[PDB]
Design an enzyme around this catalytic site. Structure first.
Site, PDB file in Angstrom:
ATOM      1  N   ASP A  29       5.703  14.340  15.371  1.00 42.97           N
ATOM      2  CA  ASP A  29       5.463  14.386  13.917  1.00 42.97           C
ATOM      3  C   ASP A  29       4.110  14.404  13.615  1.00 42.97           C
ATOM      4  OD1 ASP A  29       6.406  14.164  11.322  1.00 42.97           O
ATOM      5  OD2 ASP A  29       7.095  12.127  11.575  1.00 42.97           O
TER       6      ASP A  29
ATOM      7  N   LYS B 216       3.981  -3.368   8.980  1.00 46.58           N
ATOM      8  CA  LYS B 216       5.197  -2.558   8.726  1.00 46.58           C
ATOM      9  C   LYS B 216       6.479  -3.372   8.680  1.00 46.58           C
ATOM     10  CE  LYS B 216       5.080   2.011   9.978  1.00 46.58           C
ATOM     11  NZ  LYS B 216       5.529   2.971  10.875  1.00 46.58           N
TER      12      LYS B 216
ATOM     13  N   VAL C 184       0.801  -1.097   0.093  1.00 47.65           N
ATOM     14  CA  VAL C 184       0.108   0.049  -0.171  1.00 47.65           C
ATOM     15  C   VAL C 184       0.876   1.485   0.027  1.00 47.65           C
ATOM     16  CG1 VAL C 184      -1.737  -1.266   1.121  1.00 47.65           C
ATOM     17  CG2 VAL C 184      -0.470   0.391   2.380  1.00 47.65           C
ATOM     18  N   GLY C 185       2.132   1.105   0.064  1.00 50.99           N
ATOM     19  CA  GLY C 185       3.161   2.314   0.303  1.00 50.99           C
ATOM     20  C   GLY C 185       3.970   2.233   1.400  1.00 50.99           C
ATOM     21  N   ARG C 186       4.747   3.626   1.498  1.00 55.47           N
ATOM     22  CA  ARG C 186       5.606   3.647   2.699  1.00 55.47           C
ATOM     23  C   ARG C 186       5.144   4.740   3.349  1.00 55.47           C
ATOM     24  N   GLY C 187       5.239   4.625   4.752  1.00 55.24           N
ATOM     25  CA  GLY C 187       5.047   5.577   5.823  1.00 55.24           C
ATOM     26  C   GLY C 187       6.070   6.454   6.096  1.00 55.24           C
ATOM     27  N   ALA C 188       6.162   6.973   7.278  1.00 56.57           N
ATOM     28  CA  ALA C 188       7.539   7.766   7.899  1.00 56.57           C
ATOM     29  C   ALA C 188       8.559   7.006   7.926  1.00 56.57           C
ATOM     30  CB  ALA C 188       7.135   8.483   9.034  1.00 56.57           C
ATOM     31  N   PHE C 189       8.608   5.592   7.878  1.00 52.39           N
ATOM     32  CA  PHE C 189       9.732   4.633   7.934  1.00 52.39           C
ATOM     33  C   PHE C 189       8.932   3.182   7.679  1.00 52.39           C
ATOM     34  CE2 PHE C 189       9.988   1.999  12.062  1.00 52.39           C
ATOM     35  CZ  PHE C 189       8.769   2.662  12.605  1.00 52.39           C
ATOM     36  N   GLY C 190       9.744   2.592   6.772  1.00 54.56           N
ATOM     37  CA  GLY C 190       9.499   0.898   6.709  1.00 54.56           C
ATOM     38  C   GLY C 190       8.566   1.272   5.403  1.00 54.56           C
TER      39      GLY C 190
HETATM   40  N1  LIG Z   1       2.098   3.603   8.338  1.00 51.35           N
HETATM   41  C1  LIG Z   1       1.727   3.109   9.512  1.00 51.35           C
HETATM   42  O1  LIG Z   1       2.196   3.381  10.676  1.00 51.35           O
HETATM   43  C2  LIG Z   1       0.370   2.556   9.627  1.00 51.35           C
HETATM   44  C3  LIG Z   1      -0.058   1.822  10.647  1.00 51.35           C
HETATM   45  C4  LIG Z   1      -1.527   1.148  10.579  1.00 51.35           C
HETATM   46  C5  LIG Z   1      -1.934   1.148   9.283  1.00 51.35           C
HETATM   47  C6  LIG Z   1      -1.431   1.639   8.257  1.00 51.35           C
HETATM   48  C7  LIG Z   1      -2.192   1.676   6.939  1.00 51.35           C
HETATM   49  C8  LIG Z   1      -2.011   2.453   5.795  1.00 51.35           C
HETATM   50  C9  LIG Z   1      -2.914   1.889   5.052  1.00 51.35           C
HETATM   51  C10 LIG Z   1      -3.132   2.442   3.494  1.00 51.35           C
HETATM   52  C11 LIG Z   1      -4.303   2.107   3.054  1.00 51.35           C
HETATM   53  C12 LIG Z   1      -4.570   2.612   1.925  1.00 51.35           C
HETATM   54  C13 LIG Z   1      -5.998   2.538   0.684  1.00 51.35           C
HETATM   55  C14 LIG Z   1      -5.492   3.139  -0.306  1.00 51.35           C
HETATM   56  N2  LIG Z   1      -4.312   3.867  -0.186  1.00 51.35           N
HETATM   57  C15 LIG Z   1      -3.829   3.411   1.154  1.00 51.35           C
HETATM   58  N3  LIG Z   1      -2.739   3.855   1.423  1.00 51.35           N
HETATM   59  C16 LIG Z   1      -2.414   3.359   2.657  1.00 51.35           C
HETATM   60  O2  LIG Z   1      -1.228   3.704   3.261  1.00 51.35           O
HETATM   61  C17 LIG Z   1      -0.297   4.696   2.728  1.00 51.35           C
HETATM   62  C18 LIG Z   1      -0.075   5.992   3.349  1.00 51.35           C
HETATM   63  C19 LIG Z   1      -0.095   6.175   4.887  1.00 51.35           C
HETATM   64  C20 LIG Z   1       1.359   5.568   5.113  1.00 51.35           C
HETATM   65  O3  LIG Z   1       1.580   5.546   6.687  1.00 51.35           O
HETATM   66  C21 LIG Z   1       1.430   4.142   4.432  1.00 51.35           C
HETATM   67  C22 LIG Z   1       1.310   4.140   3.288  1.00 51.35           C
HETATM   68  O4  LIG Z   1      -3.565   1.118   5.712  1.00 51.35           O
HETATM   69  N4  LIG Z   1      -3.231   0.760   6.680  1.00 51.35           N
HETATM   70  N5  LIG Z   1      -0.194   2.322   8.303  1.00 51.35           N
END
Ligand SMILES: NC(=O)c1cccc(-c2cc(-c3cc4cc[nH]c4nc3O[C@H]3CC[C@@H](O)CC3)on2)n1
Length: 304
Positions: free
Chosen positions: A131, A38, A17-23
């Protein structure tokens, strides 16, 4: 807290689904439940992983992502799946952008403040997010419920330069003794951003040091035309240069809870398209994306 030492044979990965702040965040199905896994992308992200595992096990709040468990070889976190993605994608993401009302802008900010207040209430030491920004706020249940994520920066109440320049308190980058009131500054910027649907400091070109110089010299986002005075006062109080002049996150929860009387319909899912991708004229003041006409109407019913 209590985490499950999940094996990789129990988790079924669907897509990235993509990369967050890390991982790297991946969509997954573990024990008839949709989870987000993650995983470690680089060996440098091991400090942020230990921190998020340590803090996420302590927290338990509806407006904060749920950490189900963690793995050991290789180390990865197993949290709840946020169906609606991030708030940054809802506001400024790819087309078609979803339509949202003033009730949604205020509901999201209330849920963000509720979450941060639970972190600031932690005992024996408060937990600062550091953050707080829309890429770190996720949406679920048709975009009606907000959940704070990415606790890799989070710490017990210091280490300067934590976060992204547009929503960063001036004392954080000034090398000053910052407190939980740095999250309050970020919240005020997020409030401006969801009401106007504009990225804060888009006119100020990059890099981050250019925004840092501007915010450090008193520059705040432009004032919003026709913004209700109660909201305007709350927002600009969060932007105070003096962190002690900013309200507490618990006072923000009380205030936003009370304003929600004049913002009904926050529980309606985001389902309508938005082609009003129009940036109007900049002349010291900006137009709100949301409409406050229904607010002024409901406010008159109670106050003369
Ligand atoms: N990053 C975390 O700590 C964390 C913790 C718990 C759940 C999740 C997570 C992120 C997604 C997600 C779902 C969809 C559906 C369409 N587009 C998406 N984009 C998504 O995430 C992107 C944008 C946010 C970034 O952190 C990660 C990439 O579903 N669950 N993330």
């Amino acid at each position: 807290g209590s985490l499950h030492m999940i094996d990789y044979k129990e988790i079924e990965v669907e897509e990235v689904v993509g990369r967050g702040a890390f991982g790297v965040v991946c969509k997954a199905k573990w024990r008839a439940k949709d989870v987000a896994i993650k995983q470690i992308e680089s060996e440098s992200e091991r400090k942020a992983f230990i921190v998020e595992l340590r803090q996420l096990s302590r927290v338990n709040h509806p407006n904060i992502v749920k950490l189900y468990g963690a793995c050991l070889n290789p180390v990865c976190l197993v949290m709840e799946y946020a169906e609606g993605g991030s708030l940054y994608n809802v506001l400024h993401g790819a087309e078609p952008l979803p339509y949202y009302t003033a009730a949604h802008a205020m509901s999201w900010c209330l849920q963000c403040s509720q979450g941060v207040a639970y972190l600031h209430s932690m005992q024996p030491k408060a937990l600062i997010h550091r953050d707080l920004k829309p890429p770190n706020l996720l949406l679920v249940a048709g975009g009606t419920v907000l959940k704070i994520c990415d606790f890799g920066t989070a710490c017990d109440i210091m280490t300067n330069n934590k976060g992204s320049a547009a929503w960063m308190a001036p004392e954080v980058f000034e090398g000053s003794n910052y407190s939980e009131k740095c999250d309050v500054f970020s919240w005020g910027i997020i409030l401006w951003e969801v009401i106007t649907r504009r990225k804060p400091f888009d006119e100020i070109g990059g890099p981050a040091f250019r925004i840092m110089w501007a915010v450090h010299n008193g520059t705040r986002p432009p004032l919003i035309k026709n913004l209700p005075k109660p909201i305007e006062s709350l927002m600009t109080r969060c932007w105070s240069k003096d962190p002690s002049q900013r309200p507490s996150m618990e006072e923000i929860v009380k205030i936003m809870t009370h304003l929600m009387r004049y913002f009904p319909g926050a529980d309606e899912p985001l389902q309508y398209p938005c082609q009003h991708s129009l940036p109007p004229g900049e002349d010291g003041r900006v137009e709100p994306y949301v409409d406050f006409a229904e607010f002024y109407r409901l406010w008159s019913v109670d106050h003369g």
